[PDB]
Amino acid sequence: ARGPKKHLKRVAAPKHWMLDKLTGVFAPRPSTGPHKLRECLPLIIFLRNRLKYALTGDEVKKICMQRFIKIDGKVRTDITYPAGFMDVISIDKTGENFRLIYDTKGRFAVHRITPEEAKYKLCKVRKIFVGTKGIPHLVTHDARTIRYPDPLIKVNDTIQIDLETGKITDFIKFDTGNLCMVTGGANLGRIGVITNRERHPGSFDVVHVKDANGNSFATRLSNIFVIGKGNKPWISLPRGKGIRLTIAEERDKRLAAK
Amino acid sequence: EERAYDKAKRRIEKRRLEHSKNVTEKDKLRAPIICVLGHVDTGKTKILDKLRHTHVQDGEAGGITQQIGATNVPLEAINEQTKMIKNFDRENVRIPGMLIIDTPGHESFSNLRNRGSSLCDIAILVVDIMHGLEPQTIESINLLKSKKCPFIVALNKIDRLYDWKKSPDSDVAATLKKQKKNTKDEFEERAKAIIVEFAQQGLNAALFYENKDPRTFVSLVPTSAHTGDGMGSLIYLLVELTQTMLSKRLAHCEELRAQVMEVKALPGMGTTIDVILINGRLKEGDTIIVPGVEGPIVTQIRGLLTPPPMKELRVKNQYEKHKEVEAAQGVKILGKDLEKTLAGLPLLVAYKEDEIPVLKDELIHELKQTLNAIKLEEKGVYVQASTLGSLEALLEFLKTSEVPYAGINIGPVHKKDVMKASVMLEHDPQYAVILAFDVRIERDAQEMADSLGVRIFSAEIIYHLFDAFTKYRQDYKKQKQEEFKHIAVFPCKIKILPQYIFNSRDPIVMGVTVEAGQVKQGTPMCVPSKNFVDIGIVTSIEINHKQVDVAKKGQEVCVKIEPIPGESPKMFGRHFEATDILVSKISRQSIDALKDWFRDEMQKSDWQLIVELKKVFEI
Amino acid sequence: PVARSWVCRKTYVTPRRPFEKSRLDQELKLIGEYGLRNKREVWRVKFTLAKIRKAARELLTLDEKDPRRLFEGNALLRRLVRIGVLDEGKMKLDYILGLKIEDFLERRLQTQVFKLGLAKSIHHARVLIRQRHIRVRKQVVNIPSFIVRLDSQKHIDFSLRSPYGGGRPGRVKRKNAKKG
Amino acid sequence: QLIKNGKKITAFVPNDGCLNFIEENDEVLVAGFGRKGHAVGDIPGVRFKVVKVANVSLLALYKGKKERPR
RNA sequence: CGGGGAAUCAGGGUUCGAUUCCGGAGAGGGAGCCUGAGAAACGGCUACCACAUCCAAGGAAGGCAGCAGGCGCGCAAAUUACCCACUCCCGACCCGGGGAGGUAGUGACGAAAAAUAACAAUACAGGACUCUUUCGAGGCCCUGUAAUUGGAAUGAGUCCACUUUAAAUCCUUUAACGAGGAUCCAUUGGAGGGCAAGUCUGGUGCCAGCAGCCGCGGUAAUUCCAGCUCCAAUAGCGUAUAUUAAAGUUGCUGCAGUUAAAAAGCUCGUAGUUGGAUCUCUAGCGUUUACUUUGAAAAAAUUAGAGUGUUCAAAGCAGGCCGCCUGGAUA
RNA sequence: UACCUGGUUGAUCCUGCCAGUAGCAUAUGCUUGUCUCAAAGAUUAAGCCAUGCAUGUCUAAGUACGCACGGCCGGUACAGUGAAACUGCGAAUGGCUCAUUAAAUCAGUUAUGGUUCCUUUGGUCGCUCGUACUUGGAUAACUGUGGUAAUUCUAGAGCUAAUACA
Ligand SMILES: Nc1nc2c(ncn2[C@@H]2O[C@H](COP(=O)(O)OP(=O)(O)NP(=O)(O)O)[C@@H](O)[C@H]2O)c(=O)[nH]1
């Protein structure tokens, strides 16, 4: 069609939001921002559907327009603003801080953090370039362009940024025997340790990840995010420890709890 | 069921008793329905355009009008034209307001076959001096006398003398008294003539300000057509007459007296009905039972359309939408399936009282002389008209001219209509025609008509449609006579005139005198008794030296006959003698051929010889 | 576009041959025994059984060590033990094929209301349920085709409002009491 | 004679005395006979049968549930 | 228009897919362009072609394949309704607007649940079980074509009050009324065979008609028009027509070709298809494929299928415990 | 549920089709008590349309000398609500329909190292060596005179704004 699309049909929305069929015809339609439309989360969904604070669409803008909600220590009134992976949502009214981490089954989970941990965030560097009198530059997965990076930071490494400033505190290299998390494909939300990468020139690089419970799986390089140094994570994990336990013991656990 | 029917009838009785005992009196009366009749080109309309002050009169595509409509003048206009001469009662509270209905006048379709939907509270009769009384004017006053209603008479062409001092918008009394004396004497002489011409027709008329006593008297109001002198005097006499006479009949009560007046086919609206809403507060989205041709129809109102005030139902105007509407106006109504409906019948509006029926055999008594006389069972011509009134007019013309009609429809011509004209074509080639009056022909219909053997008679002026049809009847008679000739041999019995000069053979010149029938050229002849010997096709019949088309029942005609090419021609004396009779060769084919489509040129009272000769020829 | 679902399913299969003695008898026996309204209700239970049997049959073909067969098999058996057409002893997938229409028609609320001696005929039970006299747990049900769960069996009581149980005279008793 | 293509066909009226209810030059709905546009056991060279006459079902006129509109 | 899909179905298949999600296209037919980040835009403009509106005849103004509605076309399809409250979109914007969309009306396209009675007491030249060899004996269990007898239960309708809703409606809830031909009445097709059900009685007389097919009607019609009775499915059941299985009657699985329909009159021959044994790793390789097994990638909806008492079910994605513990799998 | 049955003969066994049987869709007939869910001018004509409505928009924050309102305080440039108009943005999304279209559309897979991109979100914005304590002219709105039968037609005259135009 002519020009860009403005709407989004409800059934055409990405599955990990878990919008039901009958509520309406349209969906939230995440607006342009740091994270991709397919792999983000509108605040209207997070507030209304996940935290169960707002009932209707009006209550969400009535919350947001009173400027009670910050994303990465910055006030956002846009109810369809895309907050994606590693983004820290802060409610300073009720003093509640959330980090958006994918759960085992492959969706953003309502994972609370201490206010002391809502100071920094981890970020995967997309590229590294230099320009105009050679001040080198870095670009990350949440589109934060940072000047004068540490020259030890190469492409596909992770960096820890203080949210109040815009400067790198510490960084993790992408090497063998490092804790990573999958952010795309069948294995989305699984945490594990790198074993090796198999470089395919002129094509996608494939990496092999071993889980804590002896489960080994492969994934594309683009869908990898280093979260810890060695085996120890630099952030809190969700309810489960990123362990994909199968339907058999899912049933056994559920029936055991009953 | 029957108990619901019983209580439905009893609650109907309650409602009409409440609507009778309601009965509001003490002033606030109903607007009278002022009817206007005439002859042909008198000035029954365009005087209304002069009353309402409308610039478009001549936009009719002809001097004549072919529909009913109500102009709907409302008090501001009455007051505006009143203040001009200012007679009586400034800002009268007692006046309902005027409602004028225009009627089309003509010789053919007998003045709209009227049946002027009655409801002619004040009938205005144009007399039009110039021409005196007219046959439609005498039959109109007979109709006005048949159902006793009060009516008045207005003159139109008073200024048309050449010598009238045209002083427009002033008193008739003044303008008449400001002329020369000889013209007044001429006007009073022709007035006396009109007064006597009404007096002889069981009336008592006079000149509108003498006595007057309009109880028995009728008011001759002189008016000018173009200038408009008398229009004030007119509306004054109308409101005076309605105030004096119609004091009790015109009560603003709450019965349901809506009457179906006209039916129209308008683009993007379906089939609309023009109704004169007199009594009954009928609501948008409320059920009505419209009396139809093929039984009654339950109709749901989509909404109420009214034309602007001081404007007619003539040209497609900006019809304003109204949700509801009080009982004093003439409005256009549209809904679902208003296809076949009857004109000049009362309209029942129904609330939710579980279907209130059976009021049709009590209406359809001796008004059956309408569209219902349709012979789908038999063959016939196809007819289409703009409005229903025009369709009735065409059908009663066909009834008078003796032609059967199969199908009828309202609105423009379509490919199904020409297909019904085509499915007729198999039966009778002549009858396969469409008579379309003042309707838009479609391209697909026209090209389908031209591709098949189906003719369409399109005409806006009805004279052209009548003339075109009659011309086609004579053209088909000519087209039938010529190219299907000499098969109708015609009955002929010849007596030989003895001692006449005989030419023997090639050709035979025979002096004869006819005894039974008449003799024309191309009739084969035979001699019986001498077996059955034949002389085929007589070529020419001549009296003395001059040629003649027919024999004069005992003429001394010398006929030139050439026998048909055979193995041998027959000879006088050898084969046939002077004593032997000459009889025409009439067969089953010839008698059947001369039976139908030969009844105008065919013999008068000599028929019997056919029955007398078919018995001896064995038929 | 409208915010409505069009997910609708047929619950009965008509027989191949319309008129066949031996069959018509067998269906009429089932109606007669369990006071069913029409042959649609027998075909409904045949269709549901057939679908369960087809699920069991298509599970058997997979190998005995397959995670999918194990999980699906256990879930099916659990549900058929839950509804009460099997027991813990006979809880093998093979035995699913050895069920029949009787086993499923026994679990109708109509049948159980008759079998527990609330109603005194199979026809009375259907009326009693439909008249809002019967209730399971604290829920007043009026569905003859309510398939009762094994653990939910031990309490089908009269709905408290009911004249039969609750203790409130109906229209007939009220009218007879006023004219008494 | 049909309405769409305007060509002539012969249609068989179904039940006893149904021909009485039809008259010449009436609007009639006709259906296929049953054998997919072929002939019938007895009647040769007809494919079609009349189902409605003058916007009224012949079954209704036969069983007397309606009357021909006049 | 193409896909996601739909109907049918052993396995293989055949047929459909204008139609709610994705992509494409066009605003009567073509063509040209202004503005803008984005248009060759039509609820923007300019011209021609076809239709057509107003008119003081000088000129002016057109685009429903948006929602209603009308005409036409035809076998074939709903209201000129109410609201931005929900789902979302647009704007300088918490505040405005939206026939996107929501809610009613018409709706036997089709799908799920489910009324039209149940129980008790009387007599059977009724049935079974016990006694007597038979006759003839019972609160052990069944039975109907009784308009016989009896109170008990009740939704359909009528109509308070709520609740529901933007406001209403429907439903659920609940006062009052409401069952003895419970006349508060179940229809649509059949009763020779296929194929479940009458060689019963009037009528007609190869006429009228029935009959998908075979056939029935010509004076005792098991088949026509009726009465009575019975059968089938049942709030539904006929009829026509496209299509699927039956059709191993399109055959890959899987058909035929002496006589049933069928092998060229005969040989050569290019393309096509098919083709005899045999051979036991040093950051680059090993002769390269097809084949087979594994891995990542592959939109939801749909389909299969886990969990969950919508009062059950078709559904829905919810829910459950006395502020909490969950789910929104999987293939 | 991997299914068959009638029909060529005096009878038989075949080949073979016609007929029956069930499902699904469009129409249509007769019938129609309760309740939930629910398709619906596609086929023929992407044929033609009266009428009404379907795209508009302001925050403390671009331009307020409309008394349209009353309010201070009375020497306070501008208290405030705010019509109108200039300015900014939107109107290229949505909705409808299936005429066109046969390696085209479209689907799965890859490429832009060969290109543009409003908006959002980051980075950058005294890095340049050469009246400023704020420069210039107009035009809407408003007032006043008009033309044409006519349209959301507009000419002439008098003032005045900027985040318009310089
Ligand atoms: N001076 C004058 N003009 C007249 C007279 N009668 C008619 N006219 C004029 O003649 C013309 C045509 O007459 P018209 O009014 O149409 O006659 P009508 O009888 O009303 N015709 P219709 O049948 O349509 O109703 C008009 O311009 C009308 O004013 C008359 O008597 N005098």
Beta-strand level of the residues of chain B, as a percent range?
15-25%
Biggest β-sheet description of chain D? 4 strands, mixed
Total separate domains of chain B? 3
Under the CATH scheme, the architecture of the largest domain in chain B is: 3-Layer(aba) Sandwich
Fraction in helix of chain D:
under 10%
- State the separation between the terminal residues of chain D, measured CA to CA: 23 Å
Shape of chain D: globular
Counted by DSSP, the helix tally of chain D is: 1
Keywords (chain A): Acetylation, Cytoplasm, Isopeptide bond, Nucleus, Ribonucleoprotein, Ribosomal protein, RNA-binding, rRNA-binding, Ubl conjugation
GO molecular function (chain A): RNA binding; rRNA binding; structural constituent of ribosome
Main location (chain A): cytoplasm
InterPro entries (chain A): KOW (IPR005824), Rib_uL2_dom2 (IPR014722), Ribosomal_eS4 (IPR000876), Ribosomal_eS4_C (IPR032277), Ribosomal_eS4_central_region (IPR013845), Ribosomal_eS4_central_sf (IPR038237), Ribosomal_eS4_KOW (IPR041982), Ribosomal_eS4_N (IPR013843)
Your description of this structure?
Chain B: Its main location: cytoplasm. The structure is cut from a larger assembly and holds chains A (258 residues), B (619 residues), C (180 residues) and D (70 residues). Chain A is mainly beta and 258 residues long. Chain A has helices spanning 43-50, 57-64, 247-257; strands at residues 69-71, 88-91, 96-99, 112-113, 120-131, 135-140, 146-147, 158-162, 168-172, 179-182, 191-198, 206-210, 216-220, 224-226, 228-229, 232-233. In chain A, strand 11 (191-198) and strand 12 form a beta hairpin. Chain B is α/β, with parallel strands linked by helices and 619 residues long. Chain B folds into three domains: 33-245, Rossmann fold (3-Layer(aba) Sandwich); 381-481, Rossmann fold, CATH 3.40.50.10050; 492-615, Elongation Factor Tu (Ef-tu), domain 3, CATH 2.40.30. Chain B has an eight-stranded antiparallel beta sheet, with no helix packed on it. In chain D, strands 1, 2, 3 and 4 form a four-stranded mixed beta sheet that branches. Chains in contact: A-C, B-D. The interface between A and C is small, with 11 and 9 residues. The structure holds phosphoaminophosphonic acid-guanylate ester. Residues 38, 41-46, 63-65, 104-105, 128, 156-157, 159-160, 225-226 of chain B line the site of phosphoaminophosphonic acid-guanylate ester. Phosphoaminophosphonic acid-guanylate ester (GNP) is lined by residues 38, 41-46, 63-65, 104-105, 128, 156-157, 159-160, 225-226 of chain B. Chain A binds two RNA strands through helix 2, strand 6, strand 7, strand 13 and helix 3.
